[PDB]
Amino acid sequence: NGLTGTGVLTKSNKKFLPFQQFGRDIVDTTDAVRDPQTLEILDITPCSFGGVSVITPGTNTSNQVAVLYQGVNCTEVSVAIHADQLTPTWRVYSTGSNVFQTRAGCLIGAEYVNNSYECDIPIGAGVCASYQQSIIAYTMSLGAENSVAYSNNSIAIPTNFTISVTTEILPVSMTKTSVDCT
């Protein structure tokens, strides 16, 4: 009825008063609408969007890439890919075994492994990726587990030592510039 836009319509549990036409959010965005021919309240959700990140081992090593659709359920990327309605026309090959649902998005092109290594390429939410060939996605390992042998009357004292030299690099000054506005 003149209220135009794009979104996904669904049945809403909101109870409109019988004189209202639509709804608004706390940020003055439309959240519902009443059908002029059915008098039912239809929730409106925006069509899915997000970022796209490409994981690269480096062109010096391989031309394989893995694509991360940030903030998207894999069930809706696969639906839109089949129906051909995803803005980025290029499509990563999906062999079923290379599609993984991370907490950051849908990761395509990387085979998830149950092992854990030090993080090479940080993806997010504890998941990293590396090249090992193919691209593997794993949950990063924080370090080697250790258990000190604590006891009531046991102490460990070093019998030797090591002189180590470490280097620290600190920026001190920028580059001075002067600009003539005119």
Binding site: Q20, G23, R24
Partner: peptide, 23 residues
């Protein structure tokens, strides 16, 4: 005629827009 206090009434719905749990 006379004069009386109106208190806190006379409030109407300014539009036909649904809003839930908002100020």
């Amino acid at each position: 005629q006379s004069y009386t206090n109106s208190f806190t009434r006379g409030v109407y719905y300014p539009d036909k827009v649904f809003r839930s749990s908002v100020l």
